Ligand binder design. Structure first.
Ligand SMILES: CCCCCCCCCCCCCCCCCCCC(=O)O[C@H](COC(=O)CCCCCCCCCCCCCC)COP(=O)(O)OCCN
Ligand SMILES: CCCCCCCCCCCCCCCCCCCC(=O)O[C@H](COC(=O)CCCCCCCCCCCCCC)COP(=O)(O)OCCN
Ligand SMILES: CC(C)CCC[C@@H](C)[C@H]1CC[C@H]2[C@@H]3CC=C4C[C@@H](OC(=O)CCC(=O)O)CC[C@]4(C)[C@H]3CC[C@]12C
Ligand SMILES: CC(C)CCC[C@@H](C)[C@H]1CC[C@H]2[C@@H]3CC=C4C[C@@H](OC(=O)CCC(=O)O)CC[C@]4(C)[C@H]3CC[C@]12C
Ligand SMILES: CC(C)[C@@]12C[C@@H](OC(=O)CO)[C@@](C)(O1)[C@@H]1CC[C@@H](C)[C@H]1[C@@H]2OC(=O)/C=C/c1ccccc1
Ligand SMILES: CC(C)[C@@]12C[C@@H](OC(=O)CO)[C@@](C)(O1)[C@@H]1CC[C@@H](C)[C@H]1[C@@H]2OC(=O)/C=C/c1ccccc1
Ligand SMILES: [Ca+2]
Ligand SMILES: [Ca+2]
Ligand SMILES: [Zn+2]
Ligand SMILES: [Zn+2]
Lengths: 693, 693
């Protein structure tokens, strides 16, 4: 009979598997087992009797451990029996690490009892305050903080001190666990509620550094991410506890050194805090400065008002330029009026581009449409460099719409330079058919057309301000990452198959003269030389994705049936792989990404729209192009703000603690430790009655 | 060693983080802590003893607050201990806002005790009746309503009174919270069960206005949506409690001022109420008036009966026209017979359109097929204007099938007018090859063909009456919204790339004469001038989505390789972006939308089919075209209906309250407040026994 030779033992090596305690320990004796059972049942009577008997005769080890690791004190703590715990403490049982067990079980009375005076379930670095913060119990954390406890200060991510490197080399696991435990203690909402001068600010900073740690710490990434999410949720709930608009303005306008704290939240990407309904209500109130009742207005009225303000944008800009203090001078200063004016200016620029789209002069002078376009381009460039000067270099490069604006402005500058070069180096009127391939006019036209495409695509950034197009834009932005990830391997496969096809087909490259219409390449009516060169092969394989490459391009002029079949088989394999596998894989990745983002789409859109709104709150950059390039003719107070913020924060912390306790109390589902402790109370009552009677 | 300089403190600024109570409060003394612990443990003995000791010696503040905010009265309420609460009340403890805590914990005895005679967890606007309605406890709500309590009347959404605007400017957060709390109290199913003359009607109106508020209130939208859903669910459950058909007819036929209440439910879009199984059973009984056993019939029998009635539709219409009172005169009056006759008439119209589809006369007289079609068109127009006259203008424009009917009828009218114009302004027989581009006959034919397309697509509305095609039609209708949302940005990208391509390629526009077949555009065998004009560029980029635009259209006649490559690169970028990114994004959005609608697809289909059925219940509009344009030869009772409806509503409310209490009682999952109160009972029993013994 064939058997499993070795499953649990090696040297034992017939039809049975004998079982033994391989890692045998020290078993409890009869009296020790009886004493521990009496402690478990909670009868004070025989527990006390056995304690006195062991004191007198030394027959029983009162520090005996249940083979599972629990002692009499640990059992009493687990049973939440304060009387038996007091009795054991008065008999001087071993109290080592029992405070940690009491903290974890969250017995306030046990914590006070142990504060008033081997194997462990906790790592050696765990301290009572650290574990109390981990449990997030406000009572125990406060009780421990009333005594002078400290939390070791974590080092920076890029720290390279002797202590950090020595600890990492000696024990990387212990160092990582200690860092994670320290950050878990620090990120405790109850510990941030206490012991923190600015809980909101601390949460913002803690979430940011925890996200950075999750980035750097490739392992243990989920723990740091959930700690950062906990900090963000704590900040959002603190903002939720606000009960009046005055408190909200105090919170949001507070400067640690208007809406300073909201700008700090935006800097740390606290999307949940920013997307809070009250903060969004205040932001909408500031946004619709001119219209107090824009929210309750019919869509036709809103559309008519928007069109009227857009048509009136030049007059508003001129009024601001001449007299900033008037009925119309400061009208454009309103954030929504400013947004409408800027949108109208950009739409006018795009309309002028379209009109420009509406012949044999080398380097012709710019037309009236180009002359009108030029101030808009200069205004865009000046606004770009002004954003660089004001917001700084780091802030500008973070935005990708800023990258698109830089590309578009560089293309416009190149177009202007090429037009100037063509004007100054060309005077005659030569027909375009005989122009050079790299003629300056042709390159200028190409760059202008690409700039027009980019300028018209820049309108997608305005989708953020809309309730319907906003989350759509967010979804496209999120799935562009999957687009890039799939595009990497699409380009790899494209390069592989292009290399193969070109290696096969470069022997049959033909001159353009031999072609029916003197046309060489796949952009001809009769496609030819599709895989003659590597660049043409890449273009052909790209165009095969859309079916624009005909099948006869795999046929050579000679009667090489085997070579033509091999090329057609490479082409078919590329079609299969790329189209079916890669495109449908991309569809699946985008589907899953869409399901992931749909839960958080609203908060992301609100954060992006808040950024867009605060972009229009500042005094600078009010004039849209081309009016931004027109030279215009032109402590005790801190302490009281700090005191008001501190009072508001105290009220918020009290409300948050009460709400969190209420949420914990009203959570459906009881664990069996409550059942065992209820059993303990009932059994103690039964035995006490029996002793009395 | 690099450290995190400031995490919890700013000015403290080495390797540790000292912890202190930054927002320090007043700690409880020893005797106050002991008294509160005695209250928590529920021992009446030392609680009473400490109360008397504080009364005599003033050593203990009986109003001392646990640093978490709970006082002795609050702890007693949380422990559900009525004896200790009575003892505290007899000793005149502070009772402020304790009624709210008792209401929230839903202790009926505590509520009666407090009715019989700082920091808070409730907002200042919360009133006992409001919080009782929020908790949806029928007992406490009834107890508070027996005393003369009031709920502040909410203002309208578009209200612009001095009070509303002053409250919004002074405190927008408080005003919004107060409005939400008032509507939460009003939308309470238990409070609607009481205090409401017509609970069903109140629920319909409350859900409607809560949905309107969710629309207007962009923030706090989820709360208003869930309140409206709660009102709809309450109405649906009230309809569920019906136990007999007589009660159902009493409910549905009740007029507040047949099936009046069902029409009111349809007006408020109470889809769950309408899709109730008993209401649908009654609607099916009314729908199959002629056939008492249509439900239990073989599919072949149903198909044969439907075909027979459809073939017999002209005779039924003529019989109704001549003698409305006969065996066949009122047969078409039945809703299902009427539906079959109308479907047969429309199918005959479509068959005649197809026959019309089955040559050199300018403005020819209409053929026999067109002469037969004309009465159908006149009937459709007359039915449209009759729906305008009867149902009103607002009701008509809400339907989108009504918009399609308007477009189709306008196209038919334009076709008739153009045919008349061509007949009266053209007599000779000129070959069609030399006709003008805008010849009236050609435009009339084009409009007639578009009208035929619209008329044949109108059949999709009939999918609602089918069990399989109904939810499919609902799903298509739901995803058309995503179609439009994606089409917005598709058109934006299309305009951007069309602008770029036209700006690049408009220099190479060629005359049609220079083309091989005198054909200019992409609708030619050899496509050319694809990006010469903006409209042609838009058409070319549209047709590139389906692969119908060949690649050689990016080649210019001249040898401008750089320009051709730039144009081909714009074309490839447009293909990539539009097809891959945008189409697959649309696929993902439609997938997610389908998952969202699949849960509610059945209710939506039932509501739509109910609307279709009640469209055939009315006396008017019985004759289908072309028979609708043939001129035919032609209180005490309210009080008893109100009393019957009131009795039925009383029975329904009693049943609903009993069912909701049963549902609450049989919900799996106990929260830990029950565990703590069980501990309180056990501990009170233990201490009472100890005191006795
Ligand atoms: C040699 C001849 C070549 C001829 C080529 C002609 C055709 C050129 C057409 C270029 C079109 C590029 C594609 C633009 C698609 C924009 C889609 C934006 C969607 C979106 O909402 O993303 C936002 C950011 O936008 C952004 O990320 C910015 C979008 C644009 C960035 C890249 C700009 C490339 C410019 C190329 C110039 C080529 C010049 C050639 C001479 C989100 O924003 P978020 O911040 O939340 O981010 C969240 C990231 N998940
Ligand atoms: C210049 C030459 C032009 C030549 C053009 C020739 C081709 C024209 C073809 C037009 C076809 C338009 C597309 C019709 C698709 C109908 C799909 C209906 C699906 C559906 O069930 O939606 C129902 C409502 O129907 C509806 O919403 C109504 C559908 C139709 C509304 C739009 C009608 C457009 C008419 C265009 C006329 C053009 C004339 C040009 C001279 C749901 O119903 P619900 O109420 O539950 O809604 C729920 C909303 N989620
Ligand atoms: C799609 C084709 C026909 C080209 C049309 C180009 C523009 C005329 C469209 C494309 C995107 C549209 C924009 C999409 C996003 C918004 C944000 C939207 O913001 C609001 O909803 C106002 C309320 C607020 O945010 O304070 C205002 C309209 C606007 C500028 C739209 C104005 C009209 C735009 C510029
Ligand atoms: C698909 C091609 C062959 C063109 C055929 C056109 C018509 C002959 C088809 C297309 C849609 C069909 C309709 C789809 C929906 C319905 C609702 C359906 O309603 C029922 O199930 C009867 C029970 C009831 O609702 O009371 C009756 C058949 C009918 C009119 C179908 C009749 C036959 C129709 C008109
Ligand atoms: C759009 C532009 C960047 C393209 C489009 C080509 O232009 C032409 O071919 C004119 O002759 C060109 C020159 O530049 C390159 C040749 C090979 C390939 C890398 C092409 C590039 O295309 C993609 O980068 C990826 C496309 C893709 C993505 C997802 C699914 C399927 C395809
Ligand atoms: C790629 C290569 C293995 C192919 C591609 C053909 O080469 C050509 O035709 C040149 O003339 C060839 C010879 O060898 C076979 C002919 C019939 C079929 C089996 C083809 C094979 O293709 C697939 O095995 C499956 C393709 C597929 C997969 C998913 C969805 C759709 C299609
Ligand atoms: Ca910019
Ligand atoms: Ca109609
Ligand atoms: Zn270090
Ligand atoms: Zn008002």
């Amino acid at each position: 009979p064939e058997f499993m030779a070795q499953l649990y033992y090696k040297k034992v090596n017939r039809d049975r598997i004998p079982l033994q305690i391989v890692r045998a320990e020290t078993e409890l004796s009869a009296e020790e087992k009886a004493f521990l059972n009496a402690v478990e049942k909670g009868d004070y009577a025989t527990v006390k009797q056995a304690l006195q008997e062991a004191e007198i005769y030394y027959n029983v080890n009162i520090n005996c451990m249940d083979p599972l690791g629990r002692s009499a004190l640990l059992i009493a703590i687990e049973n939440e029996n304060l009387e038996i715990m007091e009795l054991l403490l008065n008999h001087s049982v071993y109290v080592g690490d029992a405070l940690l067990y009491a903290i974890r079980k969250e017995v306030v009375g046990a914590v006070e009892l142990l504060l008033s005076y081997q194997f462990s379930e906790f790592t050696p670095d765990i301290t009572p305050i650290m574990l109390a913060a981990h449990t997030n119990n406000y009572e125990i954390i406060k009780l421990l903080v009333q005594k002078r406890v400290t939390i070791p200060r974590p080092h920076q991510i890029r720290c390279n001190c002797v202590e950090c490197v020595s600890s990492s080399e000696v024990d990387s696991l212990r160092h990582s666990r200690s860092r994670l435990n320290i950050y878990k203690a620090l990120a405790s909402p109850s510990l941030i509620a206490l012991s923190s001068e600015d809980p909101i600010l601390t949460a913002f900073r803690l979430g940011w550094e925890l996200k950075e740690l999750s980035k750097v710490e490739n392992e243990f990434k989920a723990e740091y991410e959930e700690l950062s999410q906990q900090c963000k949720l704590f900040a959002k709930d603190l903002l939720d506890q606000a009960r009046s608009s005055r408190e909200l303005e105090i919170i949001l306008n507070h400067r640690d050194d208007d809406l300073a704290k909201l700008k700090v939240a935006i800097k740390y990407h606290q999307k949940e805090f920013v997307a809070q309904p009250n903060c969004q209500q205040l932001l909408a109130t500031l946004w619709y400065d001119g219209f107090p009742g824009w929210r309750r207005k019919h869509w036709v009225v809103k559309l008519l008002t928007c069109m009227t303000i857009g048509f009136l944008f030049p007059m508003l800009s001129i009024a601001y330029l001449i007299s900033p203090r008037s009925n119309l001078g400061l009208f454009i200063k309103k954030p929504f009026i400013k947004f409408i004016c800027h949108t109208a200016s950009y739409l006018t620029f795009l309309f002028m581009l379209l009109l420009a789209s509406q012949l044999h002069v080398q380097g012709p002078p710019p037309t009236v449409v180009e002359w009108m376009i030029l101030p808009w381009v200069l205004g865009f460039i000046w606004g770009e460099i002004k954003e660089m000067w004001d917001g700084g270099f780091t802030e500008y490069i973070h935005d990708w719409w800023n990258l698109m604006d830089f590309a578009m402005n560089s293309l416009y500058l190149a177009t202007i330079s090429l037009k100037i070069v063509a004007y100054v180096k060309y005077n005659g009127s030569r027909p375009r058919e005989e122009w050079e391939m790299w003629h300056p006019t042709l390159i200028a036209e190409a760059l202008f057309a690409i700039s027009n495409i980019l300028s018209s695509l820049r309108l997608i950034s305005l989708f953020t301000a809309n309730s319907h197009l906003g989350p759509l834009q967010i979804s496209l932005g999120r799935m562009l990452l999957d687009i890039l990830k799939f595009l990497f391997i699409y380009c790899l496969v494209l390069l592989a198959f292009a290399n193969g096809l070109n290696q096969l087909y470069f022997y049959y490259e033909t001159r353009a003269i031999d072609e029916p219409n003197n046309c060489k390449g796949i952009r001809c009516e009769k496609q030819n030389n599709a895989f003659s060169t590597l660049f043409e092969t890449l273009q052909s394989l790209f165009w095969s994705v859309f079916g624009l490459l005909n099948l006869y391009v795999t046929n050579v002029k000679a009667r090489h049936e085997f070579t033509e079949f091999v090329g057609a088989t490479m082409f078919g394999t590329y079609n299969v792989i790329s189209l079916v596998v890669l495109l449908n894989m991309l569809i699946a990745m985008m589907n899953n990404s869409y399901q992931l983002i749909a839960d958080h789409a609203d908060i992301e859109w609100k954060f992006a729209r808040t950024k867009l709104w605060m972009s229009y709150f500042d005094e600078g950059g009010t004039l849209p192009p081309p009016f931004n390039i027109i030279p215009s003719p032109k402590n005790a107070d801190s302490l009281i703000q700090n005191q008001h913020y501190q009072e508001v924060i105290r009220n918020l912390v009290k409300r948050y603690v009460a709400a969190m306790i209420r949420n914990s109390k009203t959570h459906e589902g009881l664990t069996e430790e409550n059942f065992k402790e209820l059993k303990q109370d009932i059994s103690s009552f039964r035995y006490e009655v029996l002793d009395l009677l």
